[PDB]
Ligand binder design. Structure first.
Ligand code: 9JR
Ligand code: 9JR
Ligand SMILES: *[C@@H]1O[C@H](CO)[C@@H](O[C@@H]2O[C@H](CO)[C@@H](O)[C@H](O)[C@H]2NC(C)=O)[C@H](O)[C@H]1NC(C)=O
Ligand SMILES: *[C@@H]1O[C@H](CO)[C@@H](O[C@@H]2O[C@H](CO)[C@@H](O)[C@H](O)[C@H]2NC(C)=O)[C@H](O)[C@H]1NC(C)=O
Ligand code: NAG
Ligand code: NAG
Ligand code: NAG
Ligand code: NAG
Ligand code: NAG
Ligand code: NAG
Ligand code: NAG
Ligand code: NAG
Ligand code: NAG
Ligand code: NAG
Ligand code: NAG
Ligand code: NAG
Lengths: 772, 772
């Protein structure tokens, strides 16, 4: 097909519209810029390599470069690999960028640079220098950046990349950058707000620094500023998972009451972890367009009961007052000021970590007529008592979050306490109203616990203590529930009527409920599915199921069953036929996951026992040592077969004689050492074949006919044990000249022998001596 | 040293007493009996190989054979490997055994034999034929066995190995085996007790068969019988994990009241799973010596409340009445007959699976004066209520077992429900009185829950629901407790006074209490250890610990800390020094397990931070990609270093220059491709080195000086990538002639190249062409 095999170890994509030729060499274990990069290349990415310097030669020919991403070719010691440390900082010779007359974006993050690289072209709008060793900014070094719009200078002086002195910025260093819109000086040991900043700024990031005081003039001219982040100046250090130095005398970040008066466009104000004890209403007199306010991680517990400043925030969309609790206090209740009722535009209110024992209905009354409220987050509060019926007054809300409490009858999980949540490195809400009770202390449930909550569409009970023999009487109010997460409980399936009161239930997760499955002699009614007549998806992973009182599960609605992490191996013990139809009467089942079931073999009858419409079958992670491929004939709708991570040593003699429907065959991470002579012959339906991470030496055209190979959307071959003799001449020619997508040709499709060619990439192999 | 390298692929042992030459070829992937077996061999084991036949050649030279163990060279299809099925039943040619005049024991189990092998010598005392296909016993085929004493014939006809007919035994088949003491016909589809059996029998196993009736004379002459097992005839089939057919009308096994009259010597009577509804006192009128009685898995719930037969069993040591509940009855209480008080010698009483809601003190009153009672097993009863103080009247007991119940304020776990618990295939009790409350529904504890139980030495609270912030007030009565198992709960370490009331605690297990360690911002006091002044061993595995409020753990007593399965990688994030002395002040710590902590590297300061007497360090399973060996100099008492299952690529240049104390170095399952030139030079302390499962090609004599090798107790080298060229000539010679124990030379110390010698064992290698 192809006339010229691409030997460049980089992905090349054309977007003809934009006008972009994209060359991506991310993580290609390079020590030089590869030769032969297309001269029309507009976007060149060299992230995560070990290229020790940049020079005039680097980009000589590439004069139509609009973006260079050269990040993390020498990342700071404590941020980088300890097994492959960078020996010596990136070296940028004079001249390296001045020729790139069209250069618009330059990323040099994480290269241990000591200075702002000079000689940059006047086309540059974005320059990024995060995680280098530049901790003194001089106006003379910024004159080259006349037209710069976005300047990232952060993470150059902080605990994971220390500079051991205070950051230094010359007076007015940035003022003549008359188009600068975004300046980030985060994580830099900065001690004062630099002045004067250009009035064109829209985004200013000064968080995680050592700024002890804001001067009243600091933001005087910033009448276009939309985002201001001063978080982490005078941090609140309790249970911080990074080294944390508070301001002395337990001072807050000192902010004069008129400090924001010029910020008439401000939309985002972030004051997280500033040790604030009060927030004066005067701050917000001239900020009427403010939409997002973050006051988490201060000392504002008392202020929350007063909060006069809220009267000045009628357009506020999101408010975060999380983790303002007083150390060593376990409040009886939450005192919300009535001033909360002035937040008529509020959609998201987060008050994690206030820390109180009992939530009462009236305590939430200031929120009753907030008609746009979508999310109420009272997580991580150690609440012991809450009558869930109080949320009958919150039908309009999308999410009510009571997660991580101690009640008894999405944000990345390290969110409020990580150092820099925006650090750049080298779910059932969609069903409707959601009550999240996950990780609480609920040991017993009864119908009245859910009185007045029939509007609920998703209930999350994951990670509670529920241990009772559910009999269809526990969720009677929840007539609209579509999704129940019951994972990480101790479900006892004594009654096959469990969950039957949830007549609209579409998704049920009872994964990680193994407790009562682990003890012999206990009744388990796995046929409880029969009563749920709109159930689509059932998850019962990691339940350690090795016994069942019922011989069959039944449903006319289920399409998806996850049954991973169980013991079908003992249920299907050789010589016991009783459970071989366990899934047969799930008549509409399309996807079955029975990975991780210790199935070292499949007894005969397993495939005959599958329900008739099975599309997606996983048998991964089973230690399967053998597989009668012909039995796939029973699976007449089989489309995806996942046999990854097993011990298989052979493929079928003729795949077409095993399944006429099979489209996607995943055989990665097995022990296959050779293919059968006619393996893929006439398997015209095959579209995806993964044989990576096996031990294949040879592939001949008889096993891999071109009439089948050319229809494949993807063919995975990497990490095998290819022998590159003259017997491999067809295989080597084909991979070099095929348009079928094969990943990791640059990385991991290599000869292991013979001697000469060991370790060499198959794509670069010259086998001319075989035709001499 | 050795003049003749041992090439036989079998372990050879001398017992001089003796008179034994033991050759063990278990699981050596043999297809023939290997040549060169010592002529003096007395015990020859060939179990689990694929030797297709036996002939007079097999054992020709071996005329001092006292035992042949030839098990499982052709296991029945459903009991054996599906990846290596046996093609053809074992073939025993004539005369193969008649020559072995001293043969006393012959095991031919699991070979698919169709008939009892003939021509066996008259010395034979033990013949074992389990799991073959012999299901018709003819007196003519037994005449060869005149002197036989032990005869195993079971598992020849049952669901895992069917014969599709009833077992057949000719009348008097065994009568003339006048020295037969042990006859086993279990798992055989037998329909009647064979008669007449020889009066010399001491043990008769007829369990798991189809015997519906015992005739009153079936055991008439067995006046020497000591063990009788009739279990699994008319089985009780509820929740059976094997195919189970009951007797029709669910009759019990019918046993005449005088059936045991001749059995005056009976010590063990097993009547498990016989669907008994009554046990007539008249059964035991002439059985005065009975010590063990198993009546589990019958229908004796009512009988337990009456039980007149117990008055006839004053010497009974063990009684098992487990799993006698009435189906689908949930009794309020346990009705134990007063007759239990006559069991004057009883030490073990097991009544699992009676199934009742409430245990009260007076219900155990029939046991108050059983002065020899040592264990009371009331597990798996679904008990909801029990005042634990009632056990103040059972201080003499060694174990009180309430495991697997529903209380709220060792037997292999497939024990009562396994088909054949004695099937042959091819803990804190030692601390004193134990109350086992594991796997219950205890969500809250207070001191009064343990009133009057101060005698307890071990409490098992594993797998409950305990979620509270322990503060030293929960276990106050337990003044003698030496061992607390608190694993699989939800420990909340808000207070560092947790557990301090247990002043005699020597072992604390708080493993798998990860729940509150998985949510950010929560207080965790890992320094609670300071208060436990005799704590020796602390297990906190799998707690997912990634954050801690205390920077240091402290103890003057702790010897052993298990900290596996946590996140020291994030606690020790590079650039965060705060936790680098977390373990330093555990001043007597000798053993530290910090495997499975995702430590792909160790930040500097980890070794300096270890406590001074650390002897045994595990860093296994961490993904370690690098290791500064010199840092071991800080660990001046280090004796064992376990780095198994990591990604290490190098060993230190000179181990002795890194650690003068190190005795045991485990490096198995790494990526090591070569040893340093002088690796072991002068490591006079080294006694144990494991380099197995790496990628070593070559080992030169400089790396392995013989003054060091000769002190090694063991050196593990198997599963590497040895190159057997003339450069390997020293290593090959050394391996062949050394006395150092190296395991698996027969199995897995092999050449991977060059071509000629691929797959060949190094021990068998002739490299004479290298000296031509
Ligand atoms: C030892 C095997 C006993 C039978 O199996 C079994 N399995 C379980 N999961 C459980 C269980 N019993 N029981 C005991 C039990 C036994 C029979 C009938 C009933 C229910 N009736 C209807 C109303 C009250 C009585 C409960 C309690 C439990 O929570 N769970
Ligand atoms: C958001 C973090 C809150 C602080 O941390 C924290 N961690 C825990 N594990 C828990 C916890 N609080 N609390 C709240 C809390 C906080 C401070 C003091 C006290 C108890 N005092 C003793 C005498 C008067 C009150 C309780 C309850 C709990 O069970 N557990
Ligand atoms: C931030 O700046 C401070 C100084 O303002 C740095 O602290 C100094 O560090 C050196 C050596 O570590 C000490 O000798 C000085 O006494 C320190 N001064 C103070 C005021 O502490 C600090 O290291 C800088 N932070 C980072 C991450 O580099
Ligand atoms: C135990 O013996 C019974 C009969 O004594 C066997 O049952 C017969 O099995 C054959 C073949 O499956 C059937 O055609 C007969 O109808 C059965 N007879 C009766 C009376 O049921 C049984 O197969 C044997 N069990 C094993 C494990 O081999
Ligand atoms: C190419 O560069 C331009 C300018 O920096 C950018 O807008 C575009 O997204 C880039 N395309 C990539 C990186 O694929
Ligand atoms: C919870 O509140 C409802 C009112 O919505 C009330 O009817 C119910 O009794 C309350 N439950 C408890 C336990 O107080
Ligand atoms: C329920 O909560 C758990 C625990 O916080 C979370 O991981 C899971 O995604 C939630 N389930 C759904 C369906 O949102
Ligand atoms: C489920 O299990 C058995 C039949 O398999 C039966 O006793 C029980 O009534 C069944 N219940 C349902 C709802 O199918
Ligand atoms: C050797 O055989 C005799 C007789 O069968 C037996 O008693 C002895 O235990 C055997 N020894 C070993 C080590 O197998
Ligand atoms: C116990 O049961 C036996 C027989 O079922 C009966 O004789 C006796 O009265 C019962 N006692 C109690 C206390 O239930
Ligand atoms: C438990 O029994 C003890 C007597 O041993 C008694 O003092 C105590 O009151 C009982 N506790 C309960 C909760 O009944
Ligand atoms: C406690 O009981 C569990 C079973 O529930 C067992 O796994 C564990 O070993 C026991 N602990 C001790 C110390 O015996
Ligand atoms: C420990 O907790 C109990 C109740 O949980 C409380 O009564 C007691 O005062 C606490 N102990 C101390 C020393 O505060
Ligand atoms: C544990 O550490 C805390 C400080 O983090 C301290 O207040 C407490 O008293 C310490 N407890 C012990 C037993 O050392
Ligand atoms: C070292 O501790 C491990 C537990 O990780 C133990 O299994 C091993 O036997 C110990 N080794 C020595 C030599 O004490
Ligand atoms: C390591 O070897 C050098 C040179 O022989 C020696 O000076 C040094 O003291 C040694 N270190 C240790 C810890 O033995």
């Amino acid at each position: 097909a192809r006339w010229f095999p691409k030997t460049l170890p980089c992905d090349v994509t054309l977007d003809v519209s934009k006008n972009h030729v994209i060359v991506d060499c991310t993580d290609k274990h390079l020590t030089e810029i590869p030769g032969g990069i297309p001269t029309n290349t507009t976007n060149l990415t060299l992230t995560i390599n070990h290229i020790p310097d940049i020079s005039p030669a680097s980009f000589h020919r590439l004069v139509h470069l609009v973006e260079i991403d050269f990040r993390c070719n020498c990342v700071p010691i404590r941020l980088g690999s300890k097994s492959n440390m960078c020996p010596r900082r990136l070296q940028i010779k004079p001249r390296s960028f001045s020729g790139l007359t069209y250069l618009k974006s330059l990323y040099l993050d994480g290269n241990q640079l000591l200075e702002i690289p000079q000689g940059l072209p006047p086309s540059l709008q974005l320059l990024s220098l995060e995680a280098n060793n530049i901790f003194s900014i001089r106006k003379e070094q910024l004159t080259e950046l006349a037209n710069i719009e976005i300047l990232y200078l952060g993470q150059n002086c902080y605990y994971r990349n220390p500079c051991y002195v205070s950051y230094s910025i010359e007076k007015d260093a940035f003022l003549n950058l008359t188009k600068l819109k975004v300046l980030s000086l985060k994580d830099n040991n900065v001690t004062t707000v630099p002045t004067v900043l250009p009035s064109t700024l829209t985004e200013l990031y000064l968080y995680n620094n050592m700024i002890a005081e804001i001067q009243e003039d600091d933001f005087n001219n910033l009448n276009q500023l939309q985002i201001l982040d001063l978080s982490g100046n005078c941090p609140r250090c309790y249970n911080a998972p990074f080294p944390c130095t508070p301001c002395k005398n337990n001072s807050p970040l000192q902010i004069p009451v008129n400090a924001f008066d010029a910020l008439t466009e401000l939309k985002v104000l972030r004051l997280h972890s500033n040790s604030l004890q009060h927030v004066p209403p005067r701050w917000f007199k001239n900020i009427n367009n403010l939409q997002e306010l973050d006051l988490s991680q201060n000392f504002l517990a008392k202020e929350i009961g007063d909060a006069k400043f809220l009267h000045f925030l009628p357009n506020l969309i999101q408010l975060d007052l999380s983790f303002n609790f007083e150390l060593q206090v376990y409040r009886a209740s939450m005192n919300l000021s009535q001033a909360f009722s002035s937040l008529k535009s509020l959609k998201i209110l987060r008050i994690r970590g206030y820390v109180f024992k009992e939530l009462k209905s009236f305590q939430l009354s200031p929120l009753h007529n907030l008609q746009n409220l979508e999310v109420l987050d009272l997580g991580t509060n150690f609440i012991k008592i809450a009558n869930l019926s109080m949320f009958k007054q919150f039908k309009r809300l999308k999410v009510i979050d009571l997660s991580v409490n101690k009640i008894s009858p999405v944000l990345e999980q390290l969110y409020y306490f990580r150092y820099d949540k925006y650090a750049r490195s080298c779910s059932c809400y969609k069903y409707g109203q959601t009550l999240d009770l996950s990780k609480n202390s609920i040991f017993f449930i009864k119908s009245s616990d859910f009185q007045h909550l029939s509007f609920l569409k998703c209930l999350n009970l994951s990670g509670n203590l529920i241990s009772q023999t559910l009999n269809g009487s526990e969720f009677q109010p929840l007539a609209e529930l579509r999704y129940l997460d019951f994972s990480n409980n101790r479900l006892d399936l004594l009654h096959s009527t469990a969950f039957e009161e949830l007549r609209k239930l579409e998704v049920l997760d009872i994964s990680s409920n193994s407790h009562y499955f682990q003890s012999e002699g206990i009744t388990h009614m796995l046929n409880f599915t029969k009563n749920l007549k709109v159930l689509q998806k059932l998850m019962m992973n990691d339940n350690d199921i090795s016994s069942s009182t019922s011989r069959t599960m039944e449903s006319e609605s289920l399409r998806t069953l996850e049954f991973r992490g169980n013991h079908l191996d003992v249920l299907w013990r050789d010589g016991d036929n009783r459970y071989l139809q366990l899934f047969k009467n799930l008549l509409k089942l399309e996807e079955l996951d029975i990975s991780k079931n210790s199935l070292s073999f499949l007894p005969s009858g397993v495939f005959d026992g599958m329900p008739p419409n099975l599309k997606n079958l996983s048998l991964a992670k089973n230690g399967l040592k053998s597989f009668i491929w012909e039995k796939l004939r029973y699976l007449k709708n089989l489309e995806t077969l996942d046999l990854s991570h097993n011990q298989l040593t052979t493929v079928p003699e003729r795949l077409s004689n095993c399944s006429r429907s099979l489209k996607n065959l995943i055989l990665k991470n097995n022990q296959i050492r050779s293919l059968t002579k006619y393996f893929l012959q006439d398997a015209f339906q095959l579209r995806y074949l993964d044989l990576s991470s096996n031990k294949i030496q040879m592939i001949q055209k008889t096993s891999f006919p071109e009439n089948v190979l050319n229809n494949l959307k993807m063919l995975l071959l990497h990490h095998n044990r290819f022998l590159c003799t003259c017997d491999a001449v067809w295989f080597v020619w084909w991979v070099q000249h095929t348009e079928v997508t094969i990943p990791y040709l640059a990385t991991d499709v290599t000869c292991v022998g013979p001697g000469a060619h060991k370790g060499q990439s198959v794509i670069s192999l010259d086998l001319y001596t075989c035709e001499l």
